[PDB]
Amino acid sequence: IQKTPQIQVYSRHPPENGKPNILNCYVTQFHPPHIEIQMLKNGKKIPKVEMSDMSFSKDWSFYILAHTEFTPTETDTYACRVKHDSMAEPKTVYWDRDM
Amino acid sequence: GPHSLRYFVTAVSRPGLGEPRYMEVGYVDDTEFVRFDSDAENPRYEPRARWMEQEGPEYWERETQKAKGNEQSFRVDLRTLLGYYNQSKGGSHTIQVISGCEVGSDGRLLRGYQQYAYDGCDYIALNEDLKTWTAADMAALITKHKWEQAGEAERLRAYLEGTCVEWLRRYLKNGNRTDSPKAHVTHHSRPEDKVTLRCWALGFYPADITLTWQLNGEELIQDMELVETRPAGDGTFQKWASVVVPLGKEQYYTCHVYHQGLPEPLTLRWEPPP
Amino acid sequence: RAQIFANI
């Protein structure tokens, strides 16, 4: 029995162009626990992504928070990409700065 | 009000890649306060709440050796479950347990419990009576019969009524926080006689919160979009709720924010810059 | 303090 990860991508602070910030990829509701998470800037993998410890909830599903330091600008695109056994292919979720 | 001490345990096999990964994580009232993670040369219990530094080296040593023994038991269990379910030695599998006690403000036990799962499904649970077990399938019946023949329920009841309650009291003593949300409304375009109003709550703790939008004194439930509450990553949480409204009618809608840190709920509207 | 688990 597998559970598909749910993903949110969002900044720690309201984004202001030119101002250093943190970009979060929060991944929840998945099982089994093994998962591979990458963050992507303009289509290319970001090398320094930190991973919180993993935890699980009363319904047995796992959750984890990935993050990277970033300075948003008007035109740069960020995404989080998650590979997990519940899905045939990696899932990519793009950062929407209004969300 | 009531308090709880709970341990969430995970054991995950990885055949051909290494020994199972074992984690033991402790929570006082749902806030993590200790963790052991087997993935290390000389793995040890670590505090996860700063107030835990009050415990001396003997404490950390005892909890570390007990976690190591627990880890080794689950390594055996992972093998046992392959036999019970007639499964291959090649696949990864996961055992999880949640085990703990909830006490009332008077210090009495309200509920002790222990729930196992295998590969994400309920496996066996201790009943409220602290005397019997509920098995979820035929494999868990084997465990049930084994634990019934071994006086396991009495051993576990002694833990839940004794150790669990007593240490919970110690941790509460040693560990005894809200941060109110700050809220604001943003404005974004829609196919363009419509606009989106998004009500944000930021910087709050704990995570529990409620955001609503009202028009003409009633809450909008249809077509209100909400995100699941999410960590900012600094110990605080975020949430938003949004509604699509007619262009020019923004001032007819009100966002209401409800949180335990607030003297009274917040009421706010879109505030166009001067 | 976590309990000592029993083998399943």
Numbering used by the authors:
A (entry chain B): 1 to 99
B (entry chain A): 1 to 176, 181 to 278
C (entry chain E): 1 to 8
What do the study authors state?
A second subdominant CTL epitope, S598 (H-2Kb-restricted, RCQIFANI, spanning residues 598–605 of the S glycoprotein) also elicits an appreciable CTL response; however, S598-specific CTL exhibit ∼100-fold lower functional avidity and do not protect from CTL escape in S510. We modified epitope S598 (S598Q600Y) such that it elicited a high-avidity CTL response and using the crystal structures of the H-2Kb/S598 and H-2Kb/S598Q600Y complexes, determined the basis of this enhanced immune response. As we have previously observed with other MHC/Cys-containing peptide complexes, complexes did not readily form unless the cysteine of the S598 peptide (RCQIFANI) was modified with L-α-aminobutyric acid (Aba, an isostereomer of cysteine). We also performed structural analyses and showed that enhanced immunogenicity was associated with changes in the conformations of both the peptide and the region of the MHC class I molecule that is in close association with the peptide.
In addition to main chain interactions across the length of the peptide, S598 is anchored to the MHC via the side chains of Gln-3, Phe-5 and Ile-8. In addition, the side chains of Phe-5 and Gln-3 pack against each other and between the aromatic rings of HC residues Tyr-159 and Phe-74, constraining the peptide's backbone conformation at those positions. Overall the S598 determinant displays greater complementarity for the antigen binding cleft of H-2Kb in its N-terminal region, with few stabilizing interactions observed between the HC and positions 6 and 7. In the wild type peptide structure, Glu-152 forms a salt bridge with Arg-155, the guanadinium group of which also forms a hydrogen bond with the main chain carbonyl group of the peptide's Ile-4. Importantly, Gln-3 diverges from the consensus H-2Kb-restricted ligand binding motif, in which a tyrosine is often present at position 3. Comparison of S598 to the consensus binding motif suggested a suboptimal interaction with the H-2Kb molecule at the secondary anchor position (Gln-3) and, consequently, an approach to enhance the immunogenicity of the determinant. One unexpected result was that S598 exhibited both low MHC class I and low TcR avidity.
